[PDB]
Amino acid sequence: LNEHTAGDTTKSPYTIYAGLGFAVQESCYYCHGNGGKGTTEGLIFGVPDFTSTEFQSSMTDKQIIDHINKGKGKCPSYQGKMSPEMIEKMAGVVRNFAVK
Amino acid sequence: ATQQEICKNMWDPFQSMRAVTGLMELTSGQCTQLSKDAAAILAGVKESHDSISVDKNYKVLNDEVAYHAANIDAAAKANDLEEVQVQFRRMTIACRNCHKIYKTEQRLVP
Numbered sequence: 001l002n003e004h005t006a007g008d009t010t011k012s013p014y015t016i017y018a019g020l021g022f023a024v025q026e027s028c029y030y031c032h033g034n035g036g037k038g039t040t041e042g043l044i045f046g047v048p049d050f051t052s053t054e055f056q057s058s059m060t061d062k063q064i065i066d067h068i069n070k071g072k073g074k075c076p077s078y079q080g081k082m083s084p085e086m087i088e089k090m091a092g093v094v095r096n097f098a099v100k
Numbered sequence: 101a102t103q104q105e106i107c108k109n110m111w112d113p114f115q116s117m118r119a120v121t122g123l124m125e126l127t128s129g130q131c132t133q134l135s136k137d138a139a140a141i142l143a144g145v146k147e148s149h150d151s152i153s154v155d156k157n158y159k160v161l162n163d164e165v166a167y168h169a170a171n172i173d174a175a176a177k178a179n180d181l182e183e184v185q186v187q188f189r190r191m192t193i194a195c196r197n198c199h200k201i202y203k204t205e206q207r208l209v210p
């Protein structure tokens with residue numbers, strides 16, 4: 001993955017994760033907040049723990065990208081809602097909850 | 101220091117900066133305060149970055165506040181208040197991004 005390095009917040013995956021341009025219920029932080037561990041609402045829906053090395057070892061980089069495009073169940077599909085380059089940055093954000 | 105202590109210390113500089121973004125002005129004394137406020141925020145997010153060991157995202161979120169704080173200091177030195185205004189809006193989003201991702205269920209400013 002081409003990891004996102006710090007830059008203008010209007011071009012940042014974190015701004016998208018925090019819900020820019022999205023309804024609250026379609027914003028990652030709403031379900032995957034609390035530092036990637038899951039919010040109350042996300043846990044009701046069964047979100048995984050992005051900070052867990054166990055979860056991270058359950059997906060390849062490509063599978064994270066494919067997931068963000070396609071969605072699964074209550075995790076929405078985001079293909080056509082952000083660019084492919086942004087989805088790849090977002091996959092790096094998912095990875096980065098589990099490392100220092 | 102805890103994150104709560106670090107951010108509490110940034111709140112007055114943040115407000116002092118906000119108060120000046122709605123001016124037309126260029127007072128040398130107001131650039132002094134503005135540069136000092138930008139330095140306080142840069143120092144705060146660097147202290148968080150270096151001493152609050154969370155994860156890599158937490159580091160990049162601090163870096164993106166710092167990105168815009170440094171741009172505000174540059175724009176102030178060049179007396180470009182439109183740029184000060186836009187960069188301060190973007191810095192505010194950068195503060196909020198961390199709050200929404202890491203303290204999702206607490207109402208926080210800004």
Ligand code: HEC
Nearest residue numbers: 025026027028031045046047067072073074075076090094
């Ligand atoms: C609640 C409405 C959610 C929103 C908004 C987002 N996600 Fe999600 N995510 C949610 C659930 C309930 C699950 C588990 C789905 C399952 O059946 O397993 C997930 C899962 C993921 C995963 C892991 C892949 C998987 O387990 O299927 C990833 C990488 C993921 N979600 C990423 C992600 C992103 C990047 C989001 C914002 C663009 C996002 N999710 C929002 C619930 C919700």
Ligand code: HEC
Nearest residue numbers: 103104107108111114141158161162165195198202203209
């Ligand atoms: C994560 C890398 C953060 C960045 C960037 C910013 N803030 Fe923050 N802030 C963060 C957390 C995890 C918390 C909760 C602290 C706690 O455990 O209680 C906060 C809290 C604040 C507060 C409230 C302080 C208080 O009186 O309790 C303020 C006023 C605040 N944050 C302001 C603020 C500003 C202005 C920022 C950008 C310059 C900013 N924060 C960035 C995490 C992070």
